[PDB]
Assembly symmetry: D3
Homo-oligomer: 132 residues x 6
């Protein structure tokens, strides 16, 4: 159909703030299904640098990587119709109420969730987090 898979990361601030189920539930309620999922008490720095490799020349790169290893993360592969753009829209931004970030986050770095933004992004990120 329009069936896709996408990669979501629950960032360390979500564990710190006890918002993990809240974020996952918003995705669950829109009828997206968990296909694979891993809990990382602390993700390998190399995985993070790989994950954010397109950001490696940006001023925020090192602070971002520091944050992403500052606490646990969960990586999830979600499946559903048009999953990539729909889950991206769910993620939203800190300016847009109704979305995960819009309702729950208020920082340029600590924003609770990553979601893939393209088919190409999704394939690669999935490969990073679930090589098997």
């Amino acid at each position: 159909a329009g069936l896709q898979r996408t990669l979501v990361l629950i960032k360390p601030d979500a564990f710190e703030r006890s918002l993990v189920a809240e974020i996952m539930g918003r995705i669950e309620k829109k009828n997206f299904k968990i296909v694979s999922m891993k809990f990382w008490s602390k993700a390998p720095r190399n995985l993070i640098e790989q994950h954010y490799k397109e950001h490696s020349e940006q001023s925020y790169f090192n602070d971002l990587c520091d944050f992403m290893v500052s606490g646990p993360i969960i990586s999830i592969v979600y499946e559903g119709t048009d999953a990539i753009s729909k889950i991206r829209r769910l993620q939203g931004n800190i300016l847009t109420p109704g979305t995960i970030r819009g309702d729950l986050a208020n920082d340029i770095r600590e924003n609770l969730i990553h979601a893939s933004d393209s088919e190409d992004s999704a394939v690669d990120e999935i490969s990073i987090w679930f090589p098997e």
Copy 2:
């Protein structure tokens, strides 16, 4: 600015146990129930009348089948600017914060119908509540 509008809660809402969730979003916005009917399975003729303006579309027959595939609730709601406001609450599967935006992810199975104009509202109310 007081109006009445017709809402259908579609069979997917029953399947996914989202009936109260949908009604509650409308309730919390202060719209009031004026009348309501529960159909274990809506008569097909009522559905064909309801979606008559769609009868030539490729999706019509599949839509009718779906609408009869489980229960529905037909509700008449009342409040200021009801038609437009309840249409906004319904929303679409792209934009979060609305019923479809938060809860639906399909072009056919999208939980809720709401009248979109004064004419269609009068007509749809007359269909479900003659």
Copy 3:
């Protein structure tokens, strides 16, 4: 163990916009709607029949007035052990975790009625859904 039970959503639920909240608690426990009627104002006779076993109590006339003071919904619900389970969901105004426990705080205006036995369930269903 499948049963049907009769639920009334009382006028205070409409007053306080708790209708969907109440229905949702029952929905989430996996009980299914079998039939449902909305009454903008219930006929007094139906109320007197409904609460007939109470007709000698000091509170009867005040109860009837209250039950007609705003809308009600009569619902037939179905599920395993429905009668007892929905009675437990209803609960009482003392113990939190239930509908009345979380949402109500009055001896009269307590949001919901649910049948309490197999006999009263059959009888109450026959009253609201003859």
Copy 4:
């Protein structure tokens, strides 16, 4: 980027039992209460000061009568970009996802006031919290 902004929970919130719902939406976006006052009935001159920019509008007197028709809460909230973000949370009755979008449907009774600029924030905080 830390700012503070002034919020009023209007009497309709109390009437409809939506105080916690409104405060929780702001709480969940990580804004912090820096000070807060409950008024069973706000003195009218406070409301008139608060809405003084509106003193010449047709709705002015009716707005002030509404604002004294029940309790209100004045809150100072603190957090990053607070003035703009809480304004966005407030939203309007046409915008689902926001406080007014989900919960309000009136031009007057719309649940919440939020400061809209640094100037208005400073002034409004000084009105409700002269201290």
Copy 5:
């Protein structure tokens, strides 16, 4: 009627954990009304010692007082039918799901909320927090 007033404290752990509205909302949803309310960025130690004066000989007294001044608190007078025992039941305990503490707390000290337990308690505690 059975109309009473009672005193509720929202303890510092509720601010720390962003559960303030959640606690207040549970009381609001049972139809109890706010009659008076004060925010304390930090409550005077003396008020706390007064508040918990019946506990002054207990091993935990000093640690409790330390905790109660460790962050903000809100004092609220609630009004409603049978408010004292009903709000007490809402408070509940960390062992009893369905109640505020039962759903949200898991510690003998940091338990989110205090509520008066008798008419005599309520009168006194109200006097402490709202002398006016």
Copy 6:
């Protein structure tokens, strides 16, 4: 007083979209995920080990068929008095306020498993997390 305990989210939770609802109730009581695994379909011998104390009951085979009928999540949770408190959160289908009390209505399909003693906790954690 810190303990760890083992929780399974059973396949009915996935079917009815209640995974987050269940995990959120445990999260909101301040228990922490120490480790977690998702199984699109749990190997049957794992389920059989997990329920080995039940191997002689009439329902044993049907329970195991249910447990493999869909995904499950195994979680190790940590926090004060975790084994007993999460068991209480689990509750039963007769006790409103608990997970099963609010959400379940079946003897078999009841959404969640939680360890019931220190012995069973240690053993169950070793089954799902041999590491």
